[PDB]
Structures are given as C-alpha cells and as structure tokens.
C-alpha cells in the first residue's frame, strides 16, 4: 500500500485498478460517508440535495420517461432511482462490485440490516408534492428494480452477455470519473454505454469536475480529473448530442473528494 501518497491500487498504473472495487470498497463505510444525510447543511447534504432536485427535475418535469431504465454504476445507492421510479415501468440496476451489489439487494429485500435511506426518500417525496410518504415510495421504487447485474463500463458490452431491452434511457451517477483512468477510456465507455440505449434515446450523466480522487474515510480512490470541456467533447464524440449541460459550484469537503464542483447533463443517441 501506499498510504494515502496515491490512490489506492495506483502504484503502478496511475489510476485505481478495478480489482481495489472487489477489495478495498466497503459499501457500508460509503453509505455512512456520504449519504447518510443526518444533517441537511454538511456539504455531503448539499450535493445530494441538488442531485435529488435535477433527477427530479429531468424525470417528473421534463419528459424523460419510457419503459426501461438501466443505471450504471449503482453501487449501494439507491437515490439515483427515487424520482426516476415515477416515469420508468423497469429498472436495471448495475455495478462493478460484487459486495456494492449486494448491499443493494440487502436493501430490496427490505433487511432490517439494510441501509436507512428513510430521510433521503422522506426528501424526494416532498420534492413530488408528497402524493405519497416514504414507506409507499419505497415499496413503488423495490417493485421498479427489476434486475441487479455485474457491470463493467470498460467493456463493449458492459452488462455481459445478459439480454435486456434497449432502454429508453440510461443513467449514471458518480460513476464514470471512477471507472475511467483516461479520456479514451471514458469516451469508449460512453461508447459502450449507447450498445445499450434506443436511437434517440435519453443518455442522464452526473459526476464530479476536475478531482483527481475521493476519499471513503482514510481509504483514497482514482477519479478522472475532468473539465466541462473535456465531458462535452467526450459525449459528442461518443455518438450524442446534448440537450441541457449544467455546471454546479458547490464541492464536497476536501477531506472527501478534491472535484471543483459537478456536473450534470441531458444527452441524447445521434
Ligand atoms: N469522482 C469523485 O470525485 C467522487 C465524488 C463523490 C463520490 C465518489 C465515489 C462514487 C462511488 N460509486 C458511485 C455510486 C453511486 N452511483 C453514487 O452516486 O454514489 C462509483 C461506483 O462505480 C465504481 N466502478 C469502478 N469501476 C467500474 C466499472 N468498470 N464499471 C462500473 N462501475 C465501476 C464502483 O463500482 C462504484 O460502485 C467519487
């Protein structure tokens, strides 16, 4: 190990290799870090709060819907679904790690050691004029999932050889800087990505801008140092075409990640 001088699994290829995620990624020590939502005014809160707000804002206001959603990168949250539950019939949940995959059907399968996503769901149903509470939204979002899938972003077919659909859309949040050591790496992983969307169809990205890791405690991951430059130009050349592209201010805490702010952008299939 290297102690905190580089991310973890970096030594010798400069970006945190994909086997540290089967290793060194605790689900439970993520979730306590960073969406544990206990107070609304630390930065954590403040970022997730505007994530909750423009997922809100992409599927129940404008029309991003349809019948298949397939989110990549899941890892052990959920919030990423909440709002999108309301305008999508199924959706496929996906991750690289096998122990994130597992802390994700702990929660479908409601077990009492599941994680408490009870405050962020309470957050979203205020968000939908509070039609619903929060055991109601989570029984509708438990129904929507439909399937958990291994994931690879790297590969040109990320979910394997398992069939599935075209999806109406495909989602992607705080993935693809982790996945991804290089800008040809991440625009063939945007690539691979449309192997699984409709012509046309909807492409929802939401990452952090220019950091170069994230922290889970003491324990430091690679991310993709990117620009908004750098995002636009990876997304054209992928094959879409962008229909909104929104730049944040708001960072996480130097403590946990070192981003200059998030991104978030609307594309669609050329
Ligand atoms: N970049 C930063 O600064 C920054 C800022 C804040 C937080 C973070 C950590 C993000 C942790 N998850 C996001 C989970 C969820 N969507 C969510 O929103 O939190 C990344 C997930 O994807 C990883 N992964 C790595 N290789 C992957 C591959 N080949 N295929 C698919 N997945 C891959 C892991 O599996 C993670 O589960 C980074």
Same mark, same amino acid.
Not at 140 to 163: E, H, I, W, Y
Not at 179 to 186: K, V
Not at 217 to 234: D, I, T
């Given at each position: 190990?290297?102690?905190?001088?580089?991310?973890?699994?970096?030594?010798?290829?400069?970006?945190?290799?994909?086997?540290?995620?089967?290793?060194?990624?605790?689900?439970?020590?993520?979730?306590?870090?960073?969406?544990?939502?206990?107070?609304?005014?630390?930065?954590?809160?403040?970022?997730?709060?505007?994530?909750?707000?423009?997922?809100?804002?992409?599927?129940?206001?404008?029309?991003?819907?349809?019948?298949?959603?397939?989110?990549?990168?899941?890892?052990?949250?959920?919030?990423?679904?909440?709002?999108?539950?309301?305008?999508?019939?199924?959706?496929?949940?996906?991750?690289?790690?096998?122990?994130?995959?597992?802390?994700?059907?702990?929660?479908?399968?409601?077990?009492?050691?599941?994680?408490?996503?009870?405050?962020?769901?309470?957050?979203?149903?205020?968000?939908?004029?509070?039609?619903?509470?929060?055991?109601?939204?989570?029984?509708?979002?438990?129904?929507?999932?439909?399937?958990?899938?291994?994931?690879?972003?790297?590969?040109?077919?990320?979910?394997?050889?398992?069939?599935?659909?075209?999806?109406?859309?495909?989602?992607?949040?705080?993935?693809?800087?982790?996945?991804? #050591?290089?800008?040809?790496?991440?625009?063939?992983?945007?690539?691979?990505?449309?192997?699984?969307?409709?012509?046309?169809?909807?492409?929802?990205?939401?990452?952090?801008?220019?950091?170069?890791?994230?922290?889970?405690?003491?324990?430091?991951?690679?991310?993709? #140092?990117?620009?908004?430059?750098?995002?636009?130009?990876?997304?054209?050349?992928?094959?879409?075409?962008?229909?909104?592209?929104?730049?944040?201010?708001?960072?996480?805490?130097?403590?946990?990640?070192?981003?200059?702010?998030?991104?978030?952008?609307?594309?669609?299939?050329?």
């Amino acid at each position: 190990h290297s102690s905190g001088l580089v991310p973890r699994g970096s030594m010798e290829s400069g970006f945190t290799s994909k086997d540290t995620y089967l290793s060194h990624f605790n689900p439970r020590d993520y979730l306590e870090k960073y969406y544990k939502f206990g107070s609304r005014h630390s930065a954590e809160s403040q970022i997730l709060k505007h994530l909750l707000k423009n997922l809100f804002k992409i599927f129940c206001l404008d029309g991003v819907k349809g019948d298949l959603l397939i989110d990549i990168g899941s890892g052990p949250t959920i919030y990423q679904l909440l709002s999108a539950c309301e305008s999508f019939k199924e959706i496929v949940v996906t991750d690289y790690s096998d122990q994130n995959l597992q802390e994700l059907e702990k929660w479908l399968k409601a077990a009492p050691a599941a994680f408490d996503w009870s405050p962020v769901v309470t957050y979203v149903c205020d968000l939908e004029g509070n039609r619903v509470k929060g055991p109601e939204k989570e029984e509708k979002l438990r129904q929507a999932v439909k399937q958990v899938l291994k994931c690879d972003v790297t590969q040109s077919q990320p979910l394997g050889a398992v069939p599935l659909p075209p999806a109406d859309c495909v989602l992607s949040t705080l993935c693809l800087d982790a996945a991804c #050591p290089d800008l040809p790496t991440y625009c063939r992983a945007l690539r691979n990505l449309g192997s699984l969307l409709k012509p046309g169809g909807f492409l929802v990205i939401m990452d952090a801008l220019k950091s170069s890791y994230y922290m889970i405690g003491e324990q430091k991951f690679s991310s993709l #140092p990117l620009g908004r430059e750098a995002v636009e130009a990876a997304v054209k050349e992928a094959g879409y075409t962008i229909e909104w592209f929104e730049v944040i201010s708001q960072s996480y805490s130097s403590t946990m990640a070192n981003n200059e702010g998030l991104f978030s952008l609307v594309a669609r299939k050329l």
